[PDB]
């Protein structure tokens, strides 16, 4: 272990702003849906989509960094990146996807094709694979004035309620499917989703967490 030293000179305080602290497009969700069978049922073929709620306490690299504050106020800027995979022809196809955004209070689809994917009252995006990747910004959709990171209370007015879940905190999941309907039997489509929280405002700082996590719903150590 060689111990080296160097004189440090520097000016200006602009790299510790809260706008510059909470940014830079961390990956939030990566999941792929693939095909291996030459024949499938008519019920497995109605389950070729996925969905994920945009509660962003998923990866503990960004969860610990986000829990230094109590109240936050931002917007999303989703970016969806799609690549293709194999398993005699080796060239990859060029196929179209759809990423519908379902806010709170609207019904999420339960099947790959249902009258929900055709409803005009939610913002769907149609992008190929041979294009630059898709990008949508999603505004501040709480009904309070800030997202409560830590919530000290119960959801409903009863005994058997879930502790520490704010009912006015969720944003609403987004759903992704392939629109080409022809079952590519030997391929694998992988979808990567990124998020850049911008226009940050933060209130009431907190001490950072030392002990490792134990669940994604609470703080049990």
């Amino acid at each position: 272990a060689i111990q080296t030293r160097t004189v440090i000179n520097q000016h200006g305080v602009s790299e510790t702003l809260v706008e510059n602290f909470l940014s830079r497009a961390a990956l939030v969700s990566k999941r792929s849906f693939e095909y291996k069978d030459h024949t499938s049922s008519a019920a497995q073929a109605d389950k070729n989509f996925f969905k994920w709620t945009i509660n962003t306490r998923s990866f503990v690299q960004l969860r610990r960094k986000l829990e230094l504050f109590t109240y936050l106020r931002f917007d999303a800027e989703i970016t969806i990146l799609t690549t293709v995979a194999v398993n005699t022809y080796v060239g990859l196809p060029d196929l179209t996807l759809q990423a519908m955004f379902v806010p709170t209070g609207a019904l999420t689809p339960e099947k790959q094709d249902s009258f929900h994917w055709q409803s005009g009252s939610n913002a769907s995006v149609f992008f190929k694979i041979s294009d630059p990747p898709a990008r949508i910004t999603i505004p501040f959709m709480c009904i309070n004035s800030a997202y409560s990171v830590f919530y000290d209370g119960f959801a409903g007015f009863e005994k058997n309620g879930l502790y520490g879940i704010n009912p006015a905190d969720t944003i609403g999941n987004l759903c992704v499917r392939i629109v080409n309907e022809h079952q590519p039997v030997g391929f694998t489509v992988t979808v990567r989703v990124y998020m850049k929280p911008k226009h940050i405002k933060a209130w009431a700082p907190r001490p950072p967490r030392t002990l490792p996590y134990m669940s994604i719903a609470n703080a049990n150590y």
Partner: antibody, heavy 105, light 113 residues
Framework: VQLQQSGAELVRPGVSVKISCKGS????????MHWVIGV????????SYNQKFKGKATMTVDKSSSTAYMELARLTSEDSAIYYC???????????????WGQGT | DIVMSQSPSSLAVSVGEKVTMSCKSS????????????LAWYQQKPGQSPQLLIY???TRESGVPDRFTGSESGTDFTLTISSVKAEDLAVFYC?????????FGGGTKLEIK
């Protein structure tokens, strides 16, 4: 549109047999051989067996001879029924309907 | 597994009537792309193999006379014979093919008097 197969056979328990379904009158490698729910898909296909008949049934296909074999090991006296082939229909990868039936064995 | 139970349980009618028979399913059998209920109607005369009458619960097979047209919605299904004749003695079958493994109906035997 005709599904000819083996006529009739019955052995003592402890003997494995083989049933062959010969399909003629339609083009091959475009349909899914059911069994009345195991399929074989006729194009280098393994197919999905039923859960109850999983170890009992084992089957393959021959593309040149246009036949659909099926082996049944360790037969019992409960097998006094009619096991035969159906042509199926496979458009996009989904398993489709149950068009034309076999003879009977 | 989806069970396919039949309600009328082998009715016995006379020649010249207009008969239906119920077929129950445990859950929904609607395919999404098709927006068509997957259901097959069969007919086995005694001594030979069955034969496909109606597929998709409302579409007549090519080669079937126009007396065979039956359609229902929900999880309850039927087939309607326009004119009962003396040659239509069979054990009628309803089948779901939406989800593996595929189960058949209970079997409704027609007795002609």
């Amino acid at each position: 549109v005709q599904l000819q197969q083996s006529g009739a056979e019955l052995v003592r328990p402890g003997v494995s047999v083989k049933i062959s379904c010969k399909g003629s009158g339609y083009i091959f490698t475009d349909y899914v051989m059911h069994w009345v729910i195991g399929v074989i898909s006729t194009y280098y296909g393994d197919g999905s067996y039923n859960q109850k008949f999983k170890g009992k049934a084992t089957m393959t296909v021959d593309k040149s001879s246009s036949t659909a074999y099926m082996e049944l090991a360790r037969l019992t006296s409960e097998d006094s029924a009619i096991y035969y082939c159906v042509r199926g229909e496979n458009y996009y990868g989904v398993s489709g309907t149950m068009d034309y039936w076999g003879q009977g064995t | 597994d989806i069970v396919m139970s039949q309600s009328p349980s082998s009715l016995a009618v006379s020649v010249g009537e207009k008969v239906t028979m119920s077929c129950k399913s445990s859950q929904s059998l609607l395919y999404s792309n098709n927006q068509k209920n997957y259901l097959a109607w069969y007919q086995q005369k005694p001594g030979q193999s069955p034969q496909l009458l109606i597929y998709w619960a409302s579409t007549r097979e090519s080669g079937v006379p126009d007396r065979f047209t039956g359609s229902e919605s929900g999880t309850d299904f039927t087939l309607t014979i326009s004119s009962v004749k003396a040659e239509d003695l069979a054990v009628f079958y309803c089948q779901q093919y939406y989800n593996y493994p595929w189960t058949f109906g209970g079997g409704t035997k027609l007795e002609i008097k």
